[PDB]
Design a protein. Sequence first.
Lengths: 285, 285, 284, 284
Amino acid sequence: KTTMHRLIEEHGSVLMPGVQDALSAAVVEKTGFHAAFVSGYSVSAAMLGLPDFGLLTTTEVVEATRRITAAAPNLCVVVDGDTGGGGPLNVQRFIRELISAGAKGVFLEDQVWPKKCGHMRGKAVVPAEEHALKIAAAREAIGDSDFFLVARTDARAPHGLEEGIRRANLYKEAGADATFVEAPANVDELKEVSAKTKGLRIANMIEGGKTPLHTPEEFKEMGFHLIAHSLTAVYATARALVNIMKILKEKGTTRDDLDQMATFSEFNELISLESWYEMESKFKN
Amino acid sequence: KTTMHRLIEEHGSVLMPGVQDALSAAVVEKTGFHAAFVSGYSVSAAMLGLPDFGLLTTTEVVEATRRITAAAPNLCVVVDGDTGGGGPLNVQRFIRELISAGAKGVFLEDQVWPKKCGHMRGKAVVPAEEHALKIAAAREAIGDSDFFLVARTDARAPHGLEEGIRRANLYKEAGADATFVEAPANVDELKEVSAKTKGLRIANMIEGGKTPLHTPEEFKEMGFHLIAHSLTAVYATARALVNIMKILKEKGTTRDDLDQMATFSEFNELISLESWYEMESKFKN
Amino acid sequence: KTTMHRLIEEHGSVLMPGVQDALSAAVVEKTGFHAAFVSGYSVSAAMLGLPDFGLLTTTEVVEATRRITAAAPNLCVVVDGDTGGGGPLNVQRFIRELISAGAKGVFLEDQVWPKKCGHMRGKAVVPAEEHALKIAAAREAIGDSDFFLVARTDARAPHGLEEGIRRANLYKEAGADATFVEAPANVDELKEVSAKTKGLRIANMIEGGKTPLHTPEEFKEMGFHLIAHSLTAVYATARALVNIMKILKEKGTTRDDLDQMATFSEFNELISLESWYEMESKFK
Amino acid sequence: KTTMHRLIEEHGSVLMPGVQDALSAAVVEKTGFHAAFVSGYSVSAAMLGLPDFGLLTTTEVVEATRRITAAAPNLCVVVDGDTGGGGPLNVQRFIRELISAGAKGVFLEDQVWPKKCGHMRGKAVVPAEEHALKIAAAREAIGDSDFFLVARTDARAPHGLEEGIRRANLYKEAGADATFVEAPANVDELKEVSAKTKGLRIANMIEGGKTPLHTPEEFKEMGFHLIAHSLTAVYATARALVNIMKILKEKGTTRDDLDQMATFSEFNELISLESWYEMESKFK
Ligand SMILES: [Mg+2]
Ligand SMILES: [Mg+2]
Ligand SMILES: [Mg+2]
Ligand SMILES: [Mg+2]
């Protein structure tokens, strides 16, 4: 059916770096990866300068998705759908719009709106049944479309692995392609997720988050098929930005320390300047 | 009149890091800077994954400007206006829109549309008079609005410092607040720009570009008042992204090398997570 | 001392036609009105072709706002905010955004999300305190901004006029500038709202609606200050398009029905083709 | 074998009403037409309240397109591309964007930037080869895409019908699917374009325009295949808004002129309030 399906087949567990925009999406594709995750958290920070505090609207992740699609046309793009922007009807519209934005899948959550990062302090969740219907709602919207449907549960934090899990299996029944139990606290937890969730499983790596950091081979072992590395891109970026700007402020110059930036061979290699010069010429007289 | 004016007074030459979005704009403000430059080149790469090859529309830099404004409300934001999006009438509309997008100034160019980076291989320029009118056009649109009007000339590349310069003085007559002679090849050139251009002068530092890299004290000396450091932010970003993603691809994990990313103390310190938690609480019962 | 407060004083009942894009805002401003309301209902239809089902997002409403505002830069423009996009924080990003988008007011509503129209079949409502807090939040985010705040309650249908009224009064105390009890069913019910809600009051005229149709001069008498005429524009528009496109479809041309469309001088009068040609020549 | 090529074959002259947003696209589709044209003129007015002065950007036209497309997902939608946003590269980003936005064709024009309308006072034109190349570029960017390409020439006013014609033929050879000589002044001039331009031909009906008003069945006879009826919608609309808002302003209410606005079942018929209520109940 799906590119995720044909992707989780061809490989063991698929590593899907988190992306916050076109340049990052570009770098991800260029580095060989076959999938990428439009991260709400990242998009919030990068696009709006906002904490993952449920301020980012469904409309905005769509705009960002459209750009990221265009910029990395090959990358199999999966989008952070948060709450899914309302009730069933909102979800469906949102789904339809992401299919038009060129994406190939969603994550949708358990949380009360407005939501927070799954590794953040004070989350709450709607009754399972209520979200089940939304999965069901997205399911119908997707139809034949090439669209992977990940149902996420933030239930562990306030209710423990038990709750989180049963919700996972319920969303699977509802018609999800795969399941995502957010923020397992350790290995044991992870492995326990793997034993009592029916079908394909996600797992989200967050540097300094609440889960142990593992590899596609290690996850294949534990039985997780899609690995979102959500904040790698943004987190790297933020350091680099703070570093270079400090250097800039106190010297007033990059002049001395240029090993922090990139080359033009490289930057333009990155974006294919030469490649364009070529197209441009095909069309003068 | 302007915040640039009152800024170029309070300081000698103002260092204005180039910005490509909210997160970067945020980091710039947070690091003490008093000004920032919405770079078309950066916005192209970051927002669209596109080379500075004149594909970015006036409408898009406006959207980006609006976000960057909101995200760094204090930063005195100056926008890369490229060609200015058409003829006089387009410029005016564009100007009006940037004033609404919360910005405080523009750079507008000499180039034939579609334009290219000022440090790029094959640029062309419209007759001086033609651009003079556009400066004049923006001038009237600005009125009392708090808006700094930098007129840029890309004439050096294809016609030499002479042409570039006379164009500079002409755009000054036309009503520009300050003047920008793009891509002086060396010090001598710079200093020559400073001797025969009447009034306030810009200077653009591009890492590995065609100009020598200098500091606000050094520029104050040479007589340049506004220093755009256009590609620092984006260039740092691109390295960091390529680095981390390579590491990610070949290990499948950041686990070992976490000194490349940022902390949560730090990331959230960056965006003020705690600060939000505080506002959020003011309003529960 | 907000612009609207000013308008409600210079006049007695401000009449505020609904508007759903740039052209309609223009026509509205060109017609002599001083205030205009961005209708979420209208906008779903005009801008997205969607029933008023709480699909139109807060992002969408703002874009919509921006254009309306630029095109009709004098109209005191007031935005239907529906639910406010979620919690008090979402409300606050939204007020900020709207202020940035050139508006001077919002209406914020009682309803569960996703909201429905105000004269539509199924409506539920969040606990009054919850909205009182959103209002409050709104208020703080408004600060000095010239931005008239309207608290709407949709409680009348599910709960009777009493609730509608206490909630209005509750929301006034939480710092709205004016209060809107949706869908009084008739004159008595208006007068009752007028008698029992303290402060500035909104009425909302919708043709075919549950509330009876009345004029400013009359409303002035019934103690109402801000009359939304929300769906008129979209409604006139919709009929116009349906008629013409029938003709165009059946007769294959407009040839015989030209008096349906507007005039060159007329149209240009609405969008100023002479104001432009001039500015254009000034800079040739 | 593009959708439009299909439409021009199933029928003889395709009649393609102009449309400037979601509601109008809807009405147009709901009325039985199979094709619709996104009018840049219309859109400047409706969406931004701007004279057709080449202010509407390529970005703007696309957003506009997307909405129109979703709301009217069967209408074979064809976009007024004006100048194409600049050089051949800009043309190409634009074709891509439009294909992504769900369209099935564009019209690309001869004019210097910034363009004006096609029946407006001052018009100049770029060297034919320059546009031929843009067309070509367009063509390549189109590839397999179901996307009917129209090359428009505005040379008739500044240069006479001869230039208009050679340029059309020039642009056909550069790989447009159809050709549009703007503003033949009358029947003779149409027939002359019909006789001297090779391939598929566009005519563009504008009420008050320079070209005389004719029907598909007639145009079929004069050898034209795609008739834009570009400004009708906006024009009907504009009159509708001006009348109503006069009434609303003078009488203070719509109370006495209700037959100007549309019906609840009617309106909802255009935007499907029953289709929704149903999907809604399916998931409660
Ligand atoms: Mg998220
Ligand atoms: Mg630039
Ligand atoms: Mg509403
Ligand atoms: Mg046009």
